């Protein structure tokens, strides 16, 4: 394993003897991770990376039905819980009962607002985060019924209701503004085919203002480059077919710098710590950046791998981010939840599967049963559900008015 | 991680 | 009026001033999914919220209730919205509300609604007088709270409060020179006040940054900052650069020195230079060292820079 090797130990943190609050914390994670790495040596077994797929399935399968009061804090993020669970199962190649999928469809219909979009639960004001989630859920199911839950004529009204003169959108009426709104609107509007000519007017320009001196993208122009916002920005530009509104060179140097030499997983910001959900937000940026670069006819691009260590990210996840009882997590010690479950898995799948036209170099770490279904690097739903949804809505006219 |  | 934590807290259903209203329960549908088993207390406040809201009862009791609804789930943006409506309608003392949101943010500094609610009040009041001091207190508990820095940039930008922020950035950079939020803030500030076009400023910056590098050579932020402030004019328009950095090869080396050199070389090539053939050889060797020995986590990127360095 790239990680359990002896030279990899030189990838340990160089403190410079000038220790700050950052060195300290980083060095702490590194030790807890080292332990996991050396887990094998101390115990005298041969290393066998395996994805506790059954344990994970039973966790997800239960949460799709009911959660403890520990989830009272995500009571305004219910379409998210459907998405995270229904996508983890989707990647684990697990089943979505013709009855459960309906209930999900029926529940989301209750979340949907008469003004368009979706709320965090029955009766909540529509918000772009839950709308993005509800739409991705409905597409993962992908049936006349699910698709039919989405009110496209109302969704455009709503999208237009949030649209800002400078190109940005609010997340909800009277709500905040940051790149998530741009990606959320772009993802749902494109999939459901409601993109008019002036919908995203000036949106690519605002998103390009979020790109700062680091090569990365921040929440709003002027802010620190962050991995979850950089994915929202890049993916939003890929949808709008405007990746080129950014300096892709520096964006590439920035994203690639985010992978932890010693841990293998990614960090959300320069000098922060690794975190499993970033296995998708950050690593997902390379496939996006492959297309982008090859699109401008780049020669130096690989025909088998992404521009990050696919091996190291799969070791990090398999070894360090898996919960014995099921579910994945931030890093060792951290508790499990459906968000990290949905994102460590999405990142594993990004890491295991490459593409480049007709090239297909999958890399599956450990037990080959560890390979996951594929996921689309823009929507983060199976590439088939994406294709299936867009075309179905494509036979509907954009809500012209 | 709070995303909303 | 009555704490959710008080030993003598009573359910809204058991309340005398809340009997004329019927608690509207959540409708998750005959066959629930991702259904949360709320506590009797969580369900109680919310059944009453659904009703007051549903009635659009813009009352003082409704006001006091959102407070409890917010404490049970501060991330409930719908309740936060109805509360702003009550703020306007009931014509509430906003400064008193500034104090409320101040305490709530201290509690959940990573909540999106609380920061936005605060921003709405400051706008209503057109008063940014408490901001930099409040933020600095939050950044004192977590020097990298994204919401705190973002809110900070808004107060400075909008109210044009730039004068003492670089002094603040310097303070925090003294506390943790690896604080990327501060390196970014320093750029935000300089680039919005004087800019980096001023030779004296540019020099002062590169000097200071070359210092932080020749002090904590493996601190990436200082490297991405120095690169950031120069790369926007051409690293190759700075002859002395390659030298001073080359001087740090054995005294302050990290794969950052090598990566920066690979970046200068790239620009001495874009701009064409004598010895370019050797330059390209030196640069590709560095790409192989970083790719094979010096920084293999990104061997895919480093060899790709080797291959692009071929074509262009
Ligand atoms: C809603 C989306 C489509 C994407 C959200 C992506 C994110 C994980 C965003 C994270 C928001 C912020 C600023 C988090 C910070 O508090 P931190 O970097 O500490 O986690
Ligand atoms: Zn995370």
XYZ file of C-alpha atoms and ligand atoms in Angstrom:
738
model
C 0.000 0.000 0.000
C 1.336 3.421 -0.968
C 0.561 4.521 2.611
C 1.973 1.608 4.611
C 5.313 1.955 2.799
C 8.454 3.054 4.733
C 9.424 6.040 2.579
C 5.889 7.511 2.960
C 6.877 8.232 6.527
C 9.017 11.056 5.216
C 5.814 12.732 4.121
C 5.348 13.601 7.799
C 4.988 17.289 8.805
C 8.024 19.574 8.756
C 7.259 21.918 11.653
C 10.322 24.166 11.013
C 10.557 24.134 14.820
C 8.225 27.100 14.546
C 5.103 25.509 15.977
C 1.762 27.314 15.707
C -1.805 26.352 16.405
C -1.829 24.916 12.885
C 1.289 22.703 13.154
C 0.019 21.301 16.427
C -3.356 20.289 15.047
C -1.948 18.887 11.831
C 0.619 16.889 13.770
C -2.206 15.543 15.910
C -4.173 14.197 12.994
C -0.984 12.738 11.519
C -0.355 10.664 14.666
C -3.932 9.320 14.850
C -3.603 8.434 11.175
C -0.159 6.892 11.562
C -1.723 4.554 14.115
C -4.347 3.418 11.626
C -1.652 2.923 9.065
C 0.510 0.857 11.383
C -2.645 -0.912 12.518
C -1.446 -3.985 10.592
C 2.201 -4.181 11.684
C 1.348 -4.216 15.375
C -1.313 -6.942 14.976
C 0.382 -9.397 12.618
C -2.253 -9.826 9.974
C -1.962 -9.116 6.248
C -3.607 -5.760 5.229
C -6.995 -6.251 3.587
C -8.765 -3.052 2.532
C -12.479 -3.834 2.368
C -15.609 -1.669 2.069
C -18.031 -2.757 4.847
C -20.752 -2.554 2.250
C -23.264 -4.623 4.195
C -22.738 -2.737 7.438
C -23.043 0.542 5.457
C -26.151 -0.752 3.671
C -27.889 -1.566 6.896
C -27.079 1.912 8.287
C -28.343 3.725 5.206
C -31.327 1.416 4.809
C -32.465 2.363 8.377
C -31.873 6.122 8.105
C -34.027 6.307 4.982
C -36.860 5.245 7.264
C -36.224 7.080 10.543
C -33.612 8.967 12.567
C -33.150 9.603 16.299
C -33.610 13.008 17.874
C -29.858 13.423 17.277
C -31.051 14.492 13.815
C -33.281 17.251 15.123
C -30.435 19.576 13.913
C -31.020 18.573 10.277
C -34.777 18.985 10.589
C -34.555 21.685 7.888
C -32.401 19.483 5.637
C -34.694 16.537 5.006
C -34.401 16.427 1.232
C -30.666 16.245 1.924
C -31.092 13.151 4.051
C -32.998 11.505 1.163
C -30.253 12.508 -1.275
C -27.293 11.420 0.858
C -28.857 8.037 1.688
C -30.370 7.402 -1.800
C -27.018 8.205 -3.333
C -24.892 6.118 -1.032
C -27.212 3.170 -1.759
C -26.936 4.208 -5.402
C -23.159 3.921 -5.259
C -23.244 0.704 -3.218
C -25.366 -0.669 -6.047
C -28.072 -1.322 -3.479
C -31.885 -1.421 -4.204
C -34.476 1.329 -4.010
C -37.835 -0.504 -3.421
C -40.656 0.542 -5.781
C -42.580 1.487 -2.638
C -39.910 3.382 -0.707
C -39.012 5.434 -3.795
C -42.650 6.394 -3.992
C -42.811 7.501 -0.366
C -39.683 9.541 -0.991
C -41.462 11.047 -4.047
C -44.550 11.645 -1.938
C -42.580 13.203 0.882
C -40.590 15.540 -1.423
C -43.905 16.602 -2.935
C -44.769 17.762 0.633
C -41.449 19.618 0.863
C -42.044 21.406 -2.478
C -43.375 24.984 -2.285
C -46.410 26.382 -4.160
C -44.000 29.159 -5.164
C -41.643 26.533 -6.631
C -38.525 24.865 -5.246
C -38.240 22.754 -2.104
C -38.170 23.400 1.617
C -36.245 21.536 4.320
C -39.342 19.587 5.296
C -43.105 19.741 4.921
C -44.127 23.366 5.115
C -40.725 25.052 5.007
C -39.927 28.002 2.752
C -38.138 26.817 -0.437
C -34.355 27.102 -0.303
C -31.849 26.301 -3.065
C -29.846 23.763 -0.980
C -32.947 21.487 -0.311
C -34.139 22.142 -3.966
C -30.800 20.936 -5.324
C -31.074 17.907 -3.069
C -34.721 17.106 -3.842
C -34.053 17.275 -7.588
C -30.980 15.027 -7.327
C -33.038 12.570 -5.211
C -35.950 12.509 -7.690
C -33.458 11.855 -10.523
C -31.670 9.055 -8.654
C -35.037 7.328 -8.466
C -35.741 8.463 -12.059
C -39.302 7.458 -12.956
C -42.234 9.213 -14.587
C -43.549 9.664 -11.052
C -40.407 11.108 -9.475
C -39.715 13.421 -12.438
C -43.358 14.419 -12.340
C -43.106 15.677 -8.733
C -40.927 18.616 -9.941
C -42.997 21.690 -10.947
C -40.852 23.204 -13.723
C -42.977 26.270 -14.392
C -42.831 27.134 -10.713
C -39.154 26.250 -10.414
C -38.256 28.945 -12.976
C -40.388 31.490 -11.126
C -38.534 30.636 -7.925
C -35.101 30.677 -9.589
C -35.882 34.060 -11.027
C -37.102 35.186 -7.609
C -33.613 34.752 -6.131
C -31.613 36.141 -9.087
C -29.442 39.165 -8.284
C -28.467 42.050 -10.535
C -24.765 41.171 -10.137
C -25.323 37.668 -11.371
C -25.502 35.865 -8.057
C -28.681 34.309 -6.568
C -29.922 34.296 -2.991
C -30.215 30.836 -1.366
C -33.769 31.732 -0.368
C -35.996 34.789 -0.150
C -34.438 37.059 2.390
C -31.499 34.638 2.560
C -27.737 34.841 2.044
C -25.640 34.854 -1.130
C -22.552 32.722 -1.919
C -21.490 30.334 -4.773
C -23.698 27.449 -3.580
C -26.718 29.325 -4.978
C -25.108 29.493 -8.408
C -24.368 25.729 -8.577
C -27.720 24.801 -7.020
C -29.669 26.869 -9.563
C -27.497 25.712 -12.497
C -27.781 21.996 -11.522
C -31.599 21.933 -11.108
C -32.390 24.298 -14.004
C -30.230 22.379 -16.490
C -31.428 18.889 -15.471
C -35.089 19.942 -15.641
C -34.483 22.026 -18.804
C -35.821 25.410 -17.659
C -32.796 27.432 -18.650
C -34.023 30.494 -20.518
C -31.588 32.846 -22.327
C -31.310 35.406 -19.528
C -31.660 33.127 -16.488
C -27.953 32.997 -15.691
C -27.110 36.410 -17.142
C -23.873 37.565 -15.592
C -23.626 34.461 -13.426
C -20.423 33.150 -14.938
C -18.850 36.549 -14.314
C -19.754 36.657 -10.621
C -18.507 33.089 -10.133
C -15.213 34.108 -11.803
C -14.885 36.976 -9.290
C -14.912 34.350 -6.522
C -11.544 32.999 -7.851
C -8.781 34.607 -5.736
C -4.942 34.882 -5.544
C -4.713 31.160 -4.518
C -6.080 29.777 -7.780
C -9.108 28.542 -5.895
C -12.643 29.868 -5.523
C -14.195 31.435 -2.351
C -17.784 31.768 -1.129
C -18.128 35.336 -2.435
C -15.583 37.589 -4.285
C -12.737 38.394 -1.869
C -12.975 35.268 0.258
C -10.441 32.484 0.903
C -10.345 29.633 -1.608
C -12.384 26.787 -0.208
C -13.002 23.294 -1.580
C -16.781 23.131 -1.280
C -17.132 26.541 -2.942
C -14.559 25.744 -5.644
C -16.593 22.664 -6.580
C -19.753 24.816 -6.724
C -18.026 27.415 -8.883
C -16.221 25.062 -11.278
C -19.197 22.703 -11.681
C -21.515 25.699 -12.180
C -19.235 26.971 -14.933
C -19.046 23.507 -16.542
C -22.837 23.459 -16.689
C -22.969 26.996 -18.183
C -20.186 25.864 -20.518
C -17.913 28.627 -19.252
C -15.112 26.910 -17.283
C -12.868 29.132 -19.384
C -14.007 32.228 -17.420
C -11.378 31.067 -14.874
C -7.609 30.642 -14.852
C -7.653 26.824 -15.031
C -3.920 26.624 -14.701
C -3.754 28.112 -11.197
C -7.010 26.424 -10.248
C -5.283 23.137 -11.064
C -2.170 23.938 -9.007
C -4.443 24.906 -6.100
C -6.677 21.826 -6.090
C -3.751 19.435 -6.483
C -2.019 21.119 -3.568
C -4.987 20.189 -1.395
C -4.217 16.517 -1.182
C -2.354 15.658 2.012
C 1.048 14.113 1.199
C 0.981 12.131 4.416
C -2.682 11.361 4.865
C -3.706 10.888 1.250
C -7.113 12.545 1.580
C -7.933 16.194 0.798
C -8.188 19.427 2.773
C -10.812 22.074 2.169
C -8.436 25.002 2.589
C -4.681 25.536 2.514
C -3.295 24.735 5.955
C -6.476 23.130 7.329
C -6.880 19.436 8.113
C -7.949 16.508 5.985
C -11.635 15.650 5.895
C -13.375 12.825 4.122
C -16.205 14.888 2.605
C -13.538 16.730 0.648
C -12.665 13.475 -1.051
C -15.494 14.613 -3.338
C -15.574 18.391 -3.191
C -11.836 18.670 -3.936
C -11.032 15.427 -5.847
C -14.181 15.866 -7.938
C -12.536 19.014 -9.423
C -9.962 17.051 -11.443
C -12.467 15.162 -13.668
C -14.130 18.543 -14.188
C -10.697 19.965 -14.971
C -9.875 17.081 -17.307
C -12.807 17.859 -19.612
C -12.131 21.570 -19.355
C -8.481 21.226 -20.340
C -8.951 18.580 -22.977
C -11.784 20.757 -24.282
C -9.228 23.399 -25.073
C -7.308 20.562 -26.730
C -4.693 19.861 -24.105
C -2.049 17.303 -25.236
C -0.173 16.641 -21.950
C -3.248 15.048 -20.349
C -3.260 11.412 -19.152
C -5.477 8.772 -20.750
C -5.808 6.595 -17.627
C -5.795 8.707 -14.442
C -6.968 11.934 -12.795
C -4.475 14.613 -11.756
C -4.372 13.416 -8.153
C -3.144 10.261 -6.362
C -6.153 7.930 -6.836
C -4.434 5.246 -4.798
C -3.698 7.413 -1.733
C -7.253 8.822 -1.596
C -8.725 5.279 -1.665
C -6.399 4.145 1.127
C -7.290 7.195 3.247
C -11.033 6.507 2.842
C -10.967 2.705 3.158
C -8.498 2.679 6.073
C -9.330 5.903 7.927
C -12.937 7.028 7.123
C -15.005 3.890 7.618
C -17.251 3.296 10.630
C -17.250 -0.347 11.881
C -20.936 -0.088 12.675
C -21.598 1.370 9.235
C -21.405 4.853 7.760
C -18.305 6.850 6.885
C -16.741 9.826 8.541
C -14.588 12.925 8.544
C -11.490 11.340 9.979
C -10.725 8.894 12.774
C -12.469 9.846 16.032
C -15.169 11.894 14.301
C -18.734 10.596 14.388
C -20.591 9.078 11.433
C -23.328 10.748 9.433
C -25.003 10.506 6.043
C -23.194 13.569 4.677
C -19.735 12.092 5.072
C -21.191 8.701 4.105
C -22.468 10.215 0.866
C -19.227 12.098 0.246
C -16.500 9.613 1.212
C -18.290 7.119 -1.043
C -18.685 9.689 -3.897
C -14.961 10.375 -3.632
C -13.984 6.697 -3.549
C -15.916 6.268 -6.805
C -14.214 9.332 -8.307
C -10.874 7.789 -7.338
C -11.702 4.316 -8.741
C -12.985 5.432 -12.090
C -11.263 7.313 -14.883
C -12.597 8.294 -18.307
C -11.285 10.407 -21.231
C -13.455 9.807 -24.284
C -13.277 6.046 -24.686
C -10.521 5.415 -22.140
C -11.547 3.565 -18.968
C -8.797 2.990 -16.326
C -10.583 2.045 -13.130
C -8.359 1.604 -10.035
C -9.946 -0.464 -7.274
C -8.078 -0.645 -3.998
C -8.265 -3.889 -2.044
C -11.055 -6.440 -2.373
C -12.430 -5.824 -5.934
C -15.871 -5.896 -4.327
C -14.831 -2.418 -3.174
C -15.628 -0.879 -6.593
C -18.581 1.507 -6.631
C -21.100 2.490 -9.256
C -20.063 5.593 -11.136
C -21.031 9.161 -10.307
C -21.218 12.226 -12.589
C -18.544 14.838 -11.526
C -20.986 17.768 -11.952
C -24.266 16.520 -10.482
C -22.858 13.861 -8.191
C -25.534 11.386 -9.251
C -25.015 8.358 -11.470
C -24.069 9.469 -14.991
C -26.970 7.362 -16.249
C -29.578 9.111 -14.083
C -28.177 12.428 -15.303
C -28.481 11.394 -18.970
C -31.880 9.825 -18.343
C -33.274 12.922 -16.572
C -32.024 15.686 -18.894
C -33.393 13.938 -21.967
C -36.748 13.247 -20.360
C -37.185 16.900 -19.459
C -35.649 17.759 -22.784
C -38.927 16.675 -24.447
C -40.645 19.504 -22.552
C -40.413 23.104 -23.653
C -38.370 25.466 -21.508
C -41.034 27.436 -19.544
C -41.062 30.341 -21.986
C -42.899 33.517 -21.058
C -19.797 20.037 8.288
C -22.626 22.509 7.946
C -23.389 23.022 4.200
C -26.671 24.967 4.615
C -39.668 34.651 28.906
C -39.263 31.019 30.044
C -36.059 29.064 29.334
C -36.093 25.779 27.483
C -33.501 24.849 30.146
C -35.339 26.126 33.209
C -36.056 23.333 35.749
C -39.605 24.633 35.797
C -40.103 24.778 32.008
C -43.602 23.772 30.902
C -44.807 22.537 27.509
C -46.767 24.991 25.383
C -49.658 22.573 25.464
C -49.650 22.857 29.267
C -49.663 26.653 28.994
C -52.529 28.868 30.019
C -51.654 31.707 27.629
C -51.439 29.136 24.778
C -54.846 27.406 24.945
C -56.811 29.462 22.466
C -54.504 28.040 19.761
C -54.494 24.480 18.400
C -51.048 22.956 17.783
C -50.606 22.193 14.122
C -48.516 18.978 13.879
C -46.039 18.122 11.166
C -47.493 16.356 8.121
C -44.835 13.927 6.885
C -47.409 11.887 5.032
C -49.002 8.455 5.712
C -45.688 6.754 4.932
C -42.689 8.710 6.343
C -39.085 8.694 5.126
C -35.964 10.106 6.911
C -38.396 10.733 9.744
C -36.903 12.313 12.887
C -38.122 11.092 16.322
C -38.388 14.466 17.962
C -38.448 14.836 21.680
C -41.757 15.749 23.295
C -40.239 19.181 23.808
C -39.034 19.695 20.217
C -42.369 18.517 18.838
C -44.256 20.701 21.294
C -42.606 24.073 20.374
C -42.823 23.294 16.657
C -46.490 22.109 16.633
C -47.102 25.541 18.087
C -44.798 27.178 15.547
C -46.631 25.574 12.606
C -49.819 27.142 13.987
C -48.691 30.692 14.811
C -46.978 30.787 11.431
C -49.924 29.169 9.688
C -52.134 31.827 11.292
C -49.443 34.407 10.510
C -50.064 35.493 14.059
C -47.571 38.377 14.254
C -47.646 38.606 18.007
C -45.386 39.067 20.928
C -46.026 35.545 22.133
C -45.243 34.303 18.635
C -41.998 36.291 18.890
C -40.938 34.733 22.154
C -41.690 31.308 20.644
C -39.451 31.593 17.602
C -36.735 32.069 20.182
C -37.374 28.610 21.542
C -37.867 27.207 18.025
C -34.481 28.676 17.068
C -32.814 27.201 20.118
C -34.193 23.750 19.263
C -32.895 24.068 15.658
C -30.944 27.247 14.909
C -30.562 26.051 11.321
C -34.288 26.428 10.694
C -34.225 29.301 8.196
C -38.086 29.478 7.967
C -38.328 30.356 11.654
C -35.508 32.850 11.234
C -37.528 34.476 8.438
C -40.799 34.747 10.383
C -38.722 36.239 13.238
C -37.470 39.057 11.007
C -41.060 39.731 9.995
C -41.999 39.993 13.663
C -39.038 42.282 14.142
C -40.471 44.718 11.617
C -44.132 44.231 12.432
C -43.996 44.310 16.220
C -41.424 47.079 15.709
C -38.839 45.495 18.000
C -35.732 47.198 19.427
C -33.137 45.940 16.996
C -30.125 46.754 19.206
C -31.669 44.475 21.762
C -31.901 41.943 18.925
C -28.231 42.575 18.007
C -27.419 41.304 21.489
C -29.532 38.189 20.967
C -27.886 37.271 17.657
C -24.500 38.124 19.256
C -24.998 35.423 21.894
C -26.468 32.912 19.412
C -23.527 33.269 17.048
C -21.128 32.765 19.973
C -22.944 29.490 20.361
C -23.196 28.386 16.711
C -20.492 30.407 14.837
C -20.742 28.040 11.870
C -24.438 28.420 11.303
C -25.376 30.184 8.084
C -28.634 31.778 9.295
C -27.236 33.517 12.355
C -24.568 35.380 10.384
C -27.015 36.414 7.735
C -29.549 37.556 10.338
C -26.860 39.721 11.917
C -25.986 41.220 8.534
C -29.673 42.093 8.020
C -29.851 43.921 11.350
C -26.632 45.917 10.688
C -28.111 46.912 7.353
C -31.425 47.913 8.936
C -29.559 49.953 11.486
C -26.809 51.163 9.114
C -24.519 50.642 12.150
C -21.211 48.747 11.682
C -19.845 50.078 14.959
C -19.885 46.783 16.890
C -18.758 44.536 14.032
C -14.983 44.417 13.912
C -14.919 43.930 17.705
C -17.504 41.164 17.679
C -15.867 39.364 14.757
C -12.427 39.610 16.369
C -13.924 37.919 19.432
C -15.228 35.060 17.297
C -11.890 34.860 15.455
C -10.321 34.731 18.883
C -12.121 31.435 19.503
C -11.468 30.164 15.982
C -9.029 32.167 13.891
C -10.366 30.632 10.686
C -14.139 30.733 10.986
C -15.098 31.213 7.281
C -18.364 32.935 8.142
C -16.547 35.377 10.503
C -13.969 36.352 7.850
C -16.657 36.677 5.154
C -18.886 38.778 7.375
C -15.784 40.846 8.242
C -14.968 41.567 4.579
C -18.540 42.723 4.084
C -18.433 45.198 7.024
C -15.092 46.608 5.787
C -16.147 46.791 2.170
C -19.633 48.260 2.628
C -18.802 50.672 5.412
C -15.369 51.406 4.030
C -13.627 50.495 7.328
C -10.157 49.774 5.893
C -7.787 51.868 8.010
C -6.799 49.503 10.793
C -7.299 46.090 9.188
C -3.769 45.565 7.943
C -2.580 46.146 11.512
C -5.044 43.423 12.581
C -3.850 41.000 9.887
C -0.261 41.543 11.054
C -1.382 40.800 14.642
C -3.006 37.522 13.666
C -0.090 36.615 11.399
C 2.084 36.988 14.492
C -0.182 34.534 16.296
C -0.218 31.866 13.532
C 1.835 32.607 10.435
C 0.259 29.537 8.903
C -3.216 31.153 9.097
C -4.285 31.144 5.445
C -7.406 33.197 6.283
C -5.120 36.018 7.389
C -2.834 35.714 4.347
C -5.944 35.984 2.247
C -7.191 38.952 4.325
C -3.878 40.738 3.845
C -4.366 40.392 0.097
C -7.999 41.513 0.358
C -6.918 44.562 2.245
C -3.824 45.655 0.275
C -5.396 44.966 -3.072
C -8.411 47.106 -2.134
C -6.508 49.956 -0.556
C -3.152 50.566 -2.264
C -2.755 47.697 -4.677
C 0.502 45.852 -5.399
C 1.441 48.047 -8.332
C 3.217 50.480 -5.996
C 6.913 49.451 -6.142
C 7.476 50.275 -2.485
C 4.433 48.259 -1.495
C 5.350 45.369 -3.784
C 8.901 45.367 -2.350
C 7.706 45.652 1.255
C 5.419 42.674 0.613
C 7.886 40.366 -1.139
C 10.456 41.234 1.538
C 8.116 40.427 4.409
C 7.005 37.272 2.639
C 10.519 36.171 1.829
C 11.067 36.648 5.560
C 8.154 34.410 6.664
C 9.457 31.858 4.157
C 13.036 32.093 5.409
C 11.590 31.510 8.897
C 9.011 28.729 8.383
C 10.177 27.359 4.936
C 7.568 24.614 4.955
C 4.598 26.939 5.600
C 2.714 26.839 2.329
C 0.608 30.024 2.716
C 3.586 32.439 2.549
C 4.653 30.641 -0.642
C 1.214 30.868 -2.297
C 1.063 34.517 -1.219
C 4.521 35.496 -2.637
C 3.642 33.610 -5.831
C 0.257 35.256 -5.871
C 1.465 38.826 -5.569
C 4.194 38.435 -8.262
C 2.727 35.896 -10.688
C 0.409 38.670 -11.695
C 3.095 40.533 -13.664
C 5.494 37.743 -14.499
C 7.900 36.074 -12.122
C 10.449 36.400 -14.935
C 10.229 40.223 -14.824
C 12.081 39.796 -11.504
C 15.694 38.685 -12.267
C 16.887 38.713 -8.655
C 14.031 36.335 -7.816
C 15.509 33.105 -9.233
C 18.720 33.872 -7.351
C 17.535 34.612 -3.818
C 15.277 31.543 -4.093
C 18.154 29.462 -5.422
C 20.089 30.629 -2.362
C 17.485 28.958 -0.129
C 18.055 25.581 -1.814
C 20.083 24.107 1.099
C 19.128 26.562 3.893
C 15.327 26.739 3.489
C 14.269 23.974 1.084
C 10.906 22.284 0.654
C 9.094 21.064 -2.455
C 7.724 24.655 -2.485
C 11.121 26.135 -3.405
C 11.346 23.570 -6.207
C 7.779 24.180 -7.277
C 8.322 27.954 -7.288
C 11.466 27.556 -9.376
C 9.499 25.339 -11.767
C 7.102 28.311 -11.931
C 9.766 30.901 -12.652
C 11.336 28.723 -15.320
C 7.858 28.346 -16.913
C 7.674 32.122 -17.274
C 11.248 32.618 -18.439
C 10.135 30.232 -21.192
C 6.762 31.855 -22.002
C 8.781 35.040 -22.424
C 11.668 33.307 -24.243
C 15.190 33.463 -22.831
C 18.739 32.562 -23.902
C 19.858 29.236 -22.454
C 16.175 28.311 -22.718
C 17.233 24.802 -23.641
C 19.111 24.336 -20.378
C 16.329 26.150 -18.517
C 13.895 23.588 -19.855
C 16.245 20.782 -18.820
C 16.629 22.135 -15.274
C 12.863 22.663 -15.003
C 11.988 19.144 -16.220
C 14.508 17.585 -13.846
C 12.864 19.492 -11.014
C 9.497 18.163 -12.336
C 10.874 14.601 -12.095
C 12.337 15.135 -8.599
C 9.027 16.518 -7.326
C 7.193 13.758 -9.233
C 9.483 10.850 -8.251
C 11.144 11.912 -4.993
C 10.302 15.351 -3.610
C 6.468 15.448 -3.811
C 4.918 12.247 -5.095
C 1.385 12.712 -3.814
C 0.904 14.774 -6.971
C 3.002 12.717 -9.381
C 0.120 12.900 -11.875
C 0.262 16.678 -11.837
C 4.067 16.992 -11.784
C 4.639 14.722 -14.776
C 1.803 16.516 -16.548
C 3.714 19.782 -16.038
C 6.702 17.924 -17.506
C 4.690 17.021 -20.599
C 3.140 20.465 -21.015
C 6.613 21.945 -20.583
C 7.401 19.886 -23.686
C 4.756 21.258 -26.003
C 4.857 24.783 -24.515
C -24.388 22.932 -0.692
C -23.341 22.512 -1.699
C -23.817 22.093 -3.078
C -22.020 22.521 -1.393
C -21.488 22.935 -0.026
C -19.988 22.755 0.007
C -19.430 22.966 1.409
C -18.937 21.765 2.180
C -19.354 24.194 1.955
C -18.799 24.429 3.352
C -19.237 25.827 3.880
C -18.236 26.389 4.877
C -17.823 27.836 4.764
C -17.735 25.612 5.849
C -16.736 26.114 6.868
O -17.429 26.411 8.096
P -15.478 24.813 7.182
O -14.387 24.925 6.066
O -14.936 25.029 8.515
O -16.180 23.446 7.059
Zn -16.362 16.889 6.300
